[PDB]
Amino acid sequence: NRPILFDIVSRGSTADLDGLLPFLLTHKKRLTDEEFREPSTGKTCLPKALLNLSNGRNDTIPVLLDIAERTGNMREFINSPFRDIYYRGQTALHIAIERRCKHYVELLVAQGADVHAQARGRFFQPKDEGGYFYFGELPLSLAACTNQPHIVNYLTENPHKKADMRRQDSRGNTVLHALVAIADNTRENTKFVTKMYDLLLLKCARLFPDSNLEAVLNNDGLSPLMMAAKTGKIGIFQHIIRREVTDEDTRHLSRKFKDWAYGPVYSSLYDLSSLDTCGEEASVLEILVYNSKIENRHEMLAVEPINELLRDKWRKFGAVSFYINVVSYLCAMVIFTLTAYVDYLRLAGEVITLFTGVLFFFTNIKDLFQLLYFIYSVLVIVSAALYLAGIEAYLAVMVFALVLGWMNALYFTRGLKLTGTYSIMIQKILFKDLFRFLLVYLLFMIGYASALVSLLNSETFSTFLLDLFKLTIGMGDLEMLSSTKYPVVFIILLVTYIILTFVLLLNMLIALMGETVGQVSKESKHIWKLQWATTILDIERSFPVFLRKAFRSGEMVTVGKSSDGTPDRRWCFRVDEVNWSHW
Amino acid sequence: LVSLLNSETFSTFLLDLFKLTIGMGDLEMLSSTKYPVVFIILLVTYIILTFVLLLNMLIALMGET
Amino acid sequence: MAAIRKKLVIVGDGACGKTCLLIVFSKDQFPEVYVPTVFENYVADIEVDGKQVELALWDTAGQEDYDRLRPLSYPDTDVILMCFSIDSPDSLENIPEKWTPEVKHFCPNVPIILVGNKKDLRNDEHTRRELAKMKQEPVKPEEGRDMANRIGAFGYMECSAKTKDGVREVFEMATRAALQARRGKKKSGC
Ligand SMILES: Nc1nc2c(ncn2[C@@H]2O[C@H](COP(=O)(O)OP(=O)(O)O)[C@@H](O)[C@H]2O)c(=O)[nH]1
Ligand SMILES: [Mg+2]
Numbered sequence: 001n002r003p004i005l006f007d008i009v010s011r012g013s014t015a016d017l018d019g020l021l022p023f024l025l026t027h028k029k030r031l032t033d034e035e036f037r038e039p040s041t042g043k044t045c046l047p048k049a050l051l052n053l054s055n056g057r058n059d060t061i062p063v064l065l066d067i068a069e070r071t072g073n074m075r076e077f078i079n080s081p082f083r084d085i086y087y088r089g090q091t092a093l094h095i096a097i098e099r100r101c102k103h104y105v106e107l108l109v110a111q112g113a114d115v116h117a118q119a120r121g122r123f124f125q126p127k128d129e130g131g132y133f134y135f136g137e138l139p140l141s142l143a144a145c146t147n148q149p150h151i152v153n154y155l156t157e158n159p160h161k162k163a164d165m166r167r168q169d170s171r172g173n174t175v176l177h178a179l180v181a182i183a184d185n186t187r188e189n190t191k192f193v194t195k196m197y198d199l200l201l202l203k204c205a206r207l208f209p210d211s212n213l214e215a216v217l218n219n220d221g222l223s224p225l226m227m228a229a230k231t232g233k234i235g236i237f238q239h240i241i242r243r244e245v246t247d248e249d250t251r252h253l254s255r256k257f258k259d260w261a262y263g264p265v266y267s268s269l270y271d272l273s274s275l276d277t278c279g280e281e282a283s284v285l286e287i288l289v290y291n292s293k294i295e296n297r298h299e300m301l302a303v304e305p306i307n308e309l310l311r312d313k314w315r316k317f318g319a320v321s322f323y324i325n326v327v328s329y330l331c332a333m334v335i336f337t338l339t340a341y342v343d344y345l346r347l348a349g350e351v352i353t354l355f356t357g358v359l360f361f362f363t364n365i366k367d368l369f370q371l372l373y374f375i376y377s378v379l380v381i382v383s384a385a386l387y388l389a390g391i392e393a394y395l396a397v398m399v400f401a402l403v404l405g406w407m408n409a410l411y412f413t414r415g416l417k418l419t420g421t422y423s424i425m426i427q428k429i430l431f432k433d434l435f436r437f438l439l440v441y442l443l444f445m446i447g448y449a450s451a452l453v454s455l456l457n458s459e460t461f462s463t464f465l466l467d468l469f470k471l472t473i474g475m476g477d478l479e480m481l482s483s484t485k486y487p488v489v490f491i492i493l494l495v496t497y498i499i500l501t502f503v504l505l506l507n508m509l510i511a512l513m514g515e516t517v518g519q520v521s522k523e524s525k526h527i528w529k530l531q532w533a534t535t536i537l538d539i540e541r542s543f544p545v546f547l548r549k550a551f552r553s554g555e556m557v558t559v560g561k562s563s564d565g566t567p568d569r570r571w572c573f574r575v576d577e578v579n580w581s582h583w
Numbered sequence: 584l585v586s587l588l589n590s591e592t593f594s595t596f597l598l599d600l601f602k603l604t605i606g607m608g609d610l611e612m613l614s615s616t617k618y619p620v621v622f623i624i625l626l627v628t629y630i631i632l633t634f635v636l637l638l639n640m641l642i643a644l645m646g647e648t
Numbered sequence: 649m650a651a652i653r654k655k656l657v658i659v660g661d662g663a664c665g666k667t668c669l670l671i672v673f674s675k676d677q678f679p680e681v682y683v684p685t686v687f688e689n690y691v692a693d694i695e696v697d698g699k700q701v702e703l704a705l706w707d708t709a710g711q712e713d714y715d716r717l718r719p720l721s722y723p724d725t726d727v728i729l730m731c732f733s734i735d736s737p738d739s740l741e742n743i744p745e746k747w748t749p750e751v752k753h754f755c756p757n758v759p760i761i762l763v764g765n766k767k768d769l770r771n772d773e774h775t776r777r778e779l780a781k782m783k784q785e786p787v788k789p790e791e792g793r794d795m796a797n798r799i800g801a802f803g804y805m806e807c808s809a810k811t812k813d814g815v816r817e818v819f820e821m822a823t824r825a826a827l828q829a830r831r832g833k834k835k836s837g838c
Contacts, residue, residue, distance in 0.1 A: 034713065079689035083720045114691070116653065116702070120724060166650040170724070211649075340586035396621040399587060403625065407632070421647050426639045434635065469627065474606045513642050521646045 002036050009049045014059040021067045031068055032076040041084035046077065050095040050104070061104060065111055078113045088121030093139050097151060105151055106158075115139055115155065115163045120170055126181070136178030137169045144175050144200060145182050147192050156203060165204045165213060172218030175200060180224050183233045185296065190235030197236065198245075205250045209563065212253075221282075223274065229284045232294030238303050241275075252568055256305075257559055264580050269557055269572040270305040276571065277313075277540045278548030285309065289533050298526035301533070308575055309553065310533060316551045317539050318532070325539070326412045332356045333405050339398060354384055357401070369411075369427065376404040415535045420528045428520060433512045441501060448497045455493070457485035472498070584626070589617035604630070652699065653691070654826040655724055656819075657706040659747060660731035661739045665765040668809040669731065670705050673819055678810060685709050694823055701823050722754040727826035729818075730762045734787045734806065735769035737779070740795065748799055759825040762801040763818060764792050767808050 008016040023029075029036070037044055049060050068077040082090045093113050096104045109115065118137045125131030135145040140163045143151040155163045168174055173181070176197065183193040204213040214224055222230070228237035245254040255271040275284045288300055301307055335356045338349050357380030364370070364377045379401040386394040414423035449468065453461050463479075470476025471494075481487050481494075520527070540548060554573035562568045584600070585593050595611075602608025603626075613619050613626075658666045670687045672678060686707045694701050706725075708718045730747060732739035743762070751760065769775045770786035779785055789806075796804035802825045805818045 034717075076689050081689075083717070088723075114689075118653070164650055168650070168652075392618075395586065395589070395618055399621055399625060402586075403629075422639075422643050425643055425647070426636060429639055429642070430635075466623070470610075473603075475603070475609065509638065509642065513646065517642065517646065524647070 010052050012058045030073045032080050041082050044080050046092045086123050089119035091117045097142050109158050141175045141178040176224040180228045183236045194239045229288045232296045265578040267576045271570050312553045421524050429512050432516045433508050437508045455490040587622040651702045653702045654726045655704050656727050657725050658729045659708050664733040666731050672809045673815050725755045728760045734764040735775045759802045761803050762796045765807045767806045
């Protein structure tokens with residue numbers, strides 16, 4: 001019976017299988033029948049045999065294959081997938097590869113086993129989706145992921161049925177995508193992954209001269225380099241960016257060339273294909289600092305061709321055009337300041353004030369703490385309706401908005417290098433500590449106001465509250481105290497309340513420097529570059545294609561004669577480095 | 584604040600506002616205001632903003648500078 | 649270039665030729681002696697318009713114990729051939745009644761091709777006499793056309809496993825429908 005066969009397969013004893021074929025032929029049963037398969041997952045005999053091995057050797061496999069060929073169900077026998085959601089789609093070849101049995105992998109390949117079978121069960125998804133191990137759901141990608149080069153070589157060089165390296169799964173990821181996915185920042189992992197990546201790329205180049213594997217994209221539309229940048233896998237991204245290959249036939253696949261040297265000074269070209277602004281395709285630099293959500297983002301800018309690109313951009317826009325954007329808000333602030341205040345000219349400027357607010361809102365909607373700026377734009381609107389009405393409350397709206405504008409000036413300070421750290425520190429304090437401290441203090445103050453009211457024994461509370469604020473200033477006299485049923489208790493409390501409000505706020509400053517600014521102090525320089533980078537990117541985004549094309553960084557270079565014969569002309573950005581060591 | 588009150592009228596307000604920062608001076612401006620209800624919150628808010636930004640300077644000075 | 653894998657599944661009443669229809673498509677040889685209850689784990693190569701597609705053909709039967717396991721063949725389905733028999737009118741009316749709700753329940757937003765098999769038997773004297781015994785007639789093409797529009801069918805064709813008539817075109821349209829990636833989403837949440 002099925003349990004007996006499963007136990008026999010578990011032991012590995014070929015002798016116990018004797019007589020199986022006569023039984024099956026007499027009963028006209030198949031090894032793929034439901035009875036023999038395990039109902040829970042559809043598991044067949046061969047997976048059970050593969051999962052158990054004695055010193056990596058199981059003698060039942062050839063007998064199982066022989067009887068499966070005898071009955072004539074070998075195709076169904078080897079292609080039978082698991083149907084459980086947990087292990088959906090798994091086949092014998094997946095187990096054979098996972099167990100590092102080269103000879104068994106070769107045997108299964110020789111016996112017509114499907115080589116493009118997918119395993120899309122929930123156990124094979126990424127961590128985010130609840131799965132445990134993700135490798136691309138292909139046997140070739142599985143072999144590549146688990147550091148098994150011989151199996152990859154065999155699968156790609158077998159005579160019976162080769163496995164196209166370009167094959168894509170349901171997600172659209174190719175083998176390179178999976179390699180990027182499983183990589184991490186640990187040194188050994190990055191080393192092995194890089195070696196596997198280079199071997200795979202060269203093999204694909206030899207097999208497919210016309211095509212370029214990295215060009216292939218997934219359903220989401222990511223190239224391996226772009227995904228590596230997004231997900232934060234630093235090592236593989238750095239290796240992909242500085243790929244250099246000596247082989248002449250595959251020279252076009254590498255990125256960083258070396259043009260000339262004059263002794264201790266070298267000048268090496270780099271490749272900005274899919275790495276620069278004003279390009280229709282997504283930019284790696286842009287996605288690295290727009291939707292990265294990577295904890296290693298700060299270290300991704302240290303790469304040679306990445307860091308310098310921003311300085312070259314800095315010359316064009318950074319240091320010369322920040323003035324203009326700053327000045328625009330200064331002029332808008334003046335136009336608004338004229339509000340409170342040549343009747344015709346004054347009215348024209350008054351119209352210009354509403355126009356400037358509307359322009360700020362129009363560019364705000366296009367761009368979408370810009371929610372603060374959104375609040376400013378929101379507040380502008382009500383004034384026009386109430387001004388047409390003649391209502392008297394439009395002034396309050398204008399007050400809120402005006403103070404918001406002068407406060408927005410701080411955002412302009414942030415862009416400049418000198419004030420870049422101070423502005424960000426002020427904002428962080430206003431958001432992390434200051435916000436929570438104010439939130440708590442407001443409720444505490446309201447409750448203590450109620451306590452003071454009780455001691456005095458809505459309007460009676462309003463007078464007390466306003467005069468208590470004056471008391472905090474100290475200008476106001478103690479009118480409340482005189483009209484109190486029990487001042488003796490209140491007097492100590494009133495001093496105590498002031499101490500508690502102040503001392504908790506005094507602690508905030510101590511809390512801010514270490515608890516909140518402790519991490520800011522260390523990473524401020526990295527954050528400032530990020531802040532500078534985001535500001536630089538927005539300037540280029542605003543300019544139209546013609547304006548962007550005016551200042552495409554780097555110089556076009558014909559790296560060398562291509563296979564077609566027309567030299568490959570990447571847009572390259574030269575990098576100059578000198579090094580006395582070596583020759 | 585001048586707009587809320589609704590050159591010399593600004594000079595009086597400015598000098599008395601400096602006195603207000605000291606606290607010795609009385610709130611003469613507030614009495615002569617078209618819309619004090621909005622101003623009252625703002626006047627406190629303005630003082631907080633001036634001081635808290637200056638309070639941050641001390642934190643900024645020790646570490647950043 | 650690089651073959652794309654599309655999953656095709658066939659659902660229909662028994663004895664309407666689903667297994668035979670796939671079998672003729674697979675080896676182009678009518679089995680005159682032995683027909684398995686199900687034809688599984690086969691992938692066929694087809695090219696329609698400049699694209700090479702590997703079509704994985706699943707098969708569903710419900711004679712005995714297969715109905716319990718039928719649902720777990722629906723996931724990750726790319727295209728469906730809902731099949732019935734032209735020489736058996738009883739098959740048609742059950743499609744809207746029972747077959748459709750199960751297909752929609754387990755796998756919605758999937759293309760469906762409604763097909764009627766064995767066009768030869770509608771003109772056969774034996775089948776015509778048998779249906780006339782109950783005051784019935786073979787499923788008319790007009791009824792099939794009306795049904796296809798009624799239940800949102802992608803296309804309606806007719807097959808003949810014995811004569812190998814229209815099989816290539818039917819599966820050709822099946823994969824053509826499969827290659828379309830639906831239309832985004834409807835009434836998606838925010
Ligand atoms: N004469 C004739 N018989 C057919 C044809 N196609 C199918 N059949 C018969 O239909 C019977 C069962 O069809 P089958 O493949 O089992 O359909 P299934 O039960 O849905 O899988 C077979 O025994 C065939 O003889 C055909 O084109 N001509
Ligand atoms: Mg059948």
